[PDB]
Amino acid sequence: DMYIERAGDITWEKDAEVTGNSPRLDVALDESGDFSLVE
């Protein structure tokens, strides 16, 4: 059986770690909910 446990408040935090790039990608979404890259 699956169960839930509280992990935190949902808030924006000033001076959080800033990382990650911003790619623009052509994708397709299938009937199963799987995304795939189109080229």
């Binding site: 839930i4 446990e5 992990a7 935090e13 800033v18 990650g20 623009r24 990608l25 995304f35």
Partner: protein, 156 residues
Amino acid sequence: GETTDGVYRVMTRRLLGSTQVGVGVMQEGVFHTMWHVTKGAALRSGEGRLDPYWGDVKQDLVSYCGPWKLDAAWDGLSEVQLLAVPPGERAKNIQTLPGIFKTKDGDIGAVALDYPAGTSGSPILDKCGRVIGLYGNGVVIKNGSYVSAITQGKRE
């Protein structure tokens, strides 16, 4: 059981020990997560039970106790925060500028951040603290890097 607003871990005892299979958001008495995390199964909250209410495999979303309540959207310009809840680790805010998933049915924001599978369902937030979507359904690109869609449902 626990109905307080906030971010929650989704755990199971089916495998070795206690395993975190995903994350979700409690808001206005409704628990929101990704479909692939629970597969539509019921959840426990202490001594209480959460039954699924709405779900869709294609959107990869599911709500418990009521209809989907999260209606904020990424503005297409500003940076956001992934409120990551990794297995066995503390909740951590990570600020990033989303990229774009371009599809035949329209454009969706995407976050290029890589966390273990059990982090699926962690919320993505705007500057007001509003949940603009959930992390955990995406793709792997050319350099082996994971990019997740900012997946949001519709509030009726």
